[PDB]
Amino acid sequence: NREEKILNREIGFAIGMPVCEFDMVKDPEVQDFRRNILNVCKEAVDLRDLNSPHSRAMYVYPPNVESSPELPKHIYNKLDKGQIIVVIWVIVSPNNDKQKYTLKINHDCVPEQVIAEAIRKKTRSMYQGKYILKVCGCDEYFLEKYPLSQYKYIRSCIMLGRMPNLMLMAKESLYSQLPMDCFTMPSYSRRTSTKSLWVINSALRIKILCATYVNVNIIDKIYVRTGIYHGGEPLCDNVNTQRVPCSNPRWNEWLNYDIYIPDLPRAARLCLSICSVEEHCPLAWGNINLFDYTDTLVSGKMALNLWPVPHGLEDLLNPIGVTGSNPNKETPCLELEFDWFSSVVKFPDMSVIEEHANWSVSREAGFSYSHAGLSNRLARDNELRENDKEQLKAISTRDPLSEITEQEKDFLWSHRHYCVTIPEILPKLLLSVKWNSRDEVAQMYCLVKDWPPIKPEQAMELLDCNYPDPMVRGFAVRCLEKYLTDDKLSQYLIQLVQVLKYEQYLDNLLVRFLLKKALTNQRIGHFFFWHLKSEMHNKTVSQRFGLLLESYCRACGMYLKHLNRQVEAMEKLINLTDILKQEKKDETQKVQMKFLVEQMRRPDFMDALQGFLSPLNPAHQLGNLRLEECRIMSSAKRPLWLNWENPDIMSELLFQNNEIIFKNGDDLRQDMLTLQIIRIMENIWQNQGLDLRMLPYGCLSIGDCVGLIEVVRNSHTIMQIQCKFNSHTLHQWLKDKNKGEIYDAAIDLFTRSCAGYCVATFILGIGDRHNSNIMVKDDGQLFHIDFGHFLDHKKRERVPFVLTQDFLIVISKGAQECTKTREFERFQEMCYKAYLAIRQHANLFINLFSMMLGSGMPELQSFDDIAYIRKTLALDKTEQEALEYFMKQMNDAHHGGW
């Protein structure tokens, strides 16, 4: 109990709320989550102590590897006859004298071969499984037998033409530094009739009693609008109450819905709102699951605390809004009464559903020609023609925002068994289902049950707000379990954490998958913790994420202690920036910096801000602060530029100073998503042998409009260049930074990076570019900063990155008529190739954005905001028509040239 009390305080500090607040929650679902989720905690700990110390080392330092060992042609061609020059460092003499041994080995060498070759070279100057390779400068290790080139550091070194520097370290020097953490089960581990839904022979009705806390400006006549939803799909007509004055919100009225109680799908929800009156307007909204976590249909009296309308939603109901009561009890509260059946009504078991499904398939197989003719949703087996099979393949290639007509819905459903042969059609088939028909849904269940597995990126769509059904989401998660690699889990983690908000219940298959992975991979565990923590201010998800964080913190081990260092450092930084903006905002930079340095140097603050792991990359150790290098930036929201020593023995070989931008006041979530997408686009380009180097720098939101930005070394804004002006000033600067034989490499890098950002910003519809948000590296690498805006952030498509004379001059190597040059023609060709490459992967990009609708991002609120990408990628047009469209967008913007 003394250890439990201390641990509870550590978790309380990490989550930012006391654990006891959970213990007080009366809700049985909350207490069942807390207890039942501990098996995932147990399993994860069991896997970590399966092959100790190695399995523990693998958890803390997982291999940072690529998804595939195969190297793209242009990347393999960068190697000398398939071989790589590698530097291996050995610390041998006292006072840590560093010895280097240059090796030329095959790119696909296992670390054990790399170590033996180093020992051979060390011996040539005068066991193999008693050492490990570590990346010089950071806590990155090569613990698993992967081809060398598969580790991201090595692949990055080949792609950039940099020398890989690895340090030989004794296994026991790492192992002894890994503490044993025994996971202890918490105190809380130790805890009429019943009829099936398909037996209740009655129509659906819900009684609306009255409303409390309806404080409005005497707004006049008010009513409650209700609807039965399955995701966003209405299951019946919307039913409103009689109009009443806001001075007395009383209805005591039964609302009858056009839906049979046995027809109710598992994910059925009641969507309601208090509206005012004809200019109708919602005032407060709220959603309810018609079945609880135990599969029980709602019965009796219930009070629902409503939510405020979001600036932009003109619609009277909010089905894609959060489901459940408002944690704030000083809000419009609507009392509702549910139907009584003199027994507990439960959703039928899978065996009842399977029996009913097989009864229907059998009944349908016996249907005569004329019977099949009564419904377009009923087709015959032998009547399936090749043209129909062709139409099916065509429908399957359409994007997730392509409208499926009622005719195609009936078509896909009648050919559902053929659909199994083309399994990627599953999301379209699911939207074709009559979710308000138990016969159809029961049959869909059995098809999902045995559905062929699909690509993890295709399965992710099935986890968004369009697919609420648990059988469907279970299938999506099973595909992620079988085919999602840790690399790709890390890449899409923000979306996967987002879609948790769409789960009906706290205890679900997705959360179990995500938690097991977070507790079996510390690299995943780290970002899992921060994505959840950053949203703990948001009362729409703070209970779910709080309980999720509590389970993670109980089983993560020693990393909780390290996370508490990062949390405390972030809090001290939030504290300082908050004082500067409320108590020192009007003072001079000199005065503000004087205050900063004095507050930072306080021993309590000084220690909290030194000797912790970078939340941007936990493999990066933040040593002592370099205060002389710390400063308040002139930028909006006055961000802090912070510098730390890299305590790593071989810091000089990576970077001797870790520079991070701490910014308080701006929502860094859109930037995080844009940067994530930029990286995905780059990966797509590289795989197709199209070397357009992007700079997706690190960015992490750590709270409500608080975050970290990775500083890019040796970079300057376009304005910073020209301020030392002619159009030749930038090209003059580049020529000055890359004199002689290396000048062409810089022009090539600029052109390539420039083509990437032209295409990326045009597709995504990023905020207008200017000399202060376009940056350039000494070597010529062009990149964009400040991704605060994207998509339709105006009210018809924009070109955010318009190439001025400055950019065209660099591309054309200093020519006057830069538009009419071969260099510019090769530049245009890179844009065309890049644009069409992304167009080919549009479903992915649409899916990545759709999974982000749950998030409170102001530019990504509806599917129509995502529609912007359908327009920029010209998906309704042909490929040549799309190329023609892009050229017109470029030609109009640049007033010619394209």
Ligand X SMILES: NC(=O)[C@@H](Nc1ccc2c(c1)OCCn1cc(N3C(=O)OC[C@H]3C(F)(F)F)nc1-2)C1CC1
Interface residues with ligand X (CB under 6 A) are: 633, 635, 639, 661, 663, 697, 709, 711-712, 715-717, 720, 775, 785-786
Residue whose CB is less far from ligand X, 503 or 786 = 786
Residue whose CB is less far from ligand X, 788 or 854 = 788
Tell me how far, at minimum, the Cβ of 573 lies from ligand X, in Å.
14
CA distance 549 to 12: 10
Residue whose CB is less far from ligand X, 437 or 722 = 722
Tell me how far, at minimum, the Cβ of 576 lies from ligand X, in Å.
16
Residue whose CB is less far from ligand X, 691 or 786 = 786
CA distance 167 to 151: 15
CA distance 242 to 225: 10
Q: Shortest CA distance to 392 belongs to which of 432, 445, 362?
A: 432
The DSSP-derived string for 813-874 is: TT-SSTTSSHHHHHHHHHHHHHHHHHHTTHHHHHHHHHTTTTS--TT-SSHHHHHHHHHHTT
Tell me how far, at minimum, the Cβ of 716 lies from ligand X, in Å.
4
Residue whose CB is less far from ligand X, 737 or 839 = 737
Residue whose CB is less far from ligand X, 103 or 775 = 775
Amino acid 160 reads L
- Beta strands across the sheet bearing 141-142: 98-106, 83-91, 165-170, 131-135, 141-142
Q: In angstroms, how far is the first alpha carbon of the chain from the final one?
A: 73
With tokens 């931008």, the residue in question is: 661
Residue with the shortest CB distance to ligand X: 635
Tell me how far, at minimum, the Cβ of 616 lies from ligand X, in Å.
11
For 778, other C-beta atoms within 10 Å of its C-beta total 15
Distance (Å) of CA 399 to CA 106, 233, 760: 42, 19, 19
Answer whether 150's CB lies under 8 Å from 66's CB: yes
Residue whose CB is less far from ligand X, 348 or 703 = 703
Residue whose CB is less far from ligand X, 668 or 809 = 668
Residue whose CB is less far from ligand X, 119 or 711 = 711
Residue whose CB is less far from ligand X, 633 or 815 = 633
Residues near 709 by beta carbon (within 8 Å), at least 6 away in sequence = 639, 660, 661, 663, 668, 697, 698, 699
What's the burial of 81, exposed, middle or buried (CB within 10 Å: 0-12/13-18/19+)?
A: exposed
Tell me how far, at minimum, the Cβ of 640 lies from ligand X, in Å.
10
CA distance 393 to 368: 28
Q: In the structure encoding, which two tokens stand for residue 787, read together?
A: 């991704």
Residues near 671 by beta carbon (within 8 Å), at least 6 away in sequence = 699, 707, 786, 787, 788
Tell me how far, at minimum, the Cβ of 637 lies from ligand X, in Å.
7
HSE-CB at 289 with a 13 A cutoff on CA atoms is 21
Residue whose CB is less far from ligand X, 420 or 633 = 633
Residue whose CB is less far from ligand X, 440 or 666 = 666
Tell me how far, at minimum, the Cβ of 629 lies from ligand X, in Å.
9
Residues near 403 by beta carbon (within 8 Å), at least 6 away in sequence = none
Residue whose CB is less far from ligand X, 654 or 711 = 711
Answer whether 615's CB lies under 8 Å from 700's CB: yes
Tell me how far, at minimum, the Cβ of 548 lies from ligand X, in Å.
30
What's the burial of 223, exposed, middle or buried (CB within 10 Å: 0-12/13-18/19+)?
A: buried
Tell me how far, at minimum, the Cβ of 788 lies from ligand X, in Å.
7
For 266, other C-beta atoms within 10 Å of its C-beta total 22
What's the burial of 112, exposed, middle or buried (CB within 10 Å: 0-12/13-18/19+)?
A: middle
Residue whose CB is less far from ligand X, 633 or 654 = 633
Residue whose CB is less far from ligand X, 54 or 585 = 585
Tell me how far, at minimum, the Cβ of 720 lies from ligand X, in Å.
6
CA distance 894 to 876: 25
Residue whose CB is less far from ligand X, 663 or 798 = 663
Tell me how far, at minimum, the Cβ of 665 lies from ligand X, in Å.
10
User: If DSSP codes are grouped into helix, strand and coil, which group holds residue 612?
Assistant: strand
Tell me how far, at minimum, the Cβ of 738 lies from ligand X, in Å.
18
With tokens 């490459």, the residue in question is: 837
Helices (H), 485-539: 486-491, 493-498, 509-520, 522-533
Tell me how far, at minimum, the Cβ of 116 lies from ligand X, in Å.
40
Tell me how far, at minimum, the Cβ of 415 lies from ligand X, in Å.
50
Tell me how far, at minimum, the Cβ of 691 lies from ligand X, in Å.
21
Answer whether 224's CB lies under 8 Å from 285's CB: no
Residue whose CB is less far from ligand X, 711 or 802 = 711
Residues near 165 by beta carbon (within 8 Å), at least 6 away in sequence = 87, 89, 135, 136, 137, 650, 653, 654
CA distance 494 to 499: 9
Answer whether 536's CB lies under 8 Å from 15's CB: yes
Q: How many residues does the chain have?
A: 898
CA distance 58 to 48: 8
Q: Which residues pair with 91 in a beta bridge?
A: 98
Tell me how far, at minimum, the Cβ of 699 lies from ligand X, in Å.
7
Tell me how far, at minimum, the Cβ of 179 lies from ligand X, in Å.
35
Q: What is the CA radius of gyration of the chain?
A: 30
For 354, other C-beta atoms within 10 Å of its C-beta total 15
Tell me how far, at minimum, the Cβ of 656 lies from ligand X, in Å.
15
Q: Quick one: which H or E segment has residue 442?
A: helix 438-449
Residue whose CB is less far from ligand X, 570 or 690 = 570
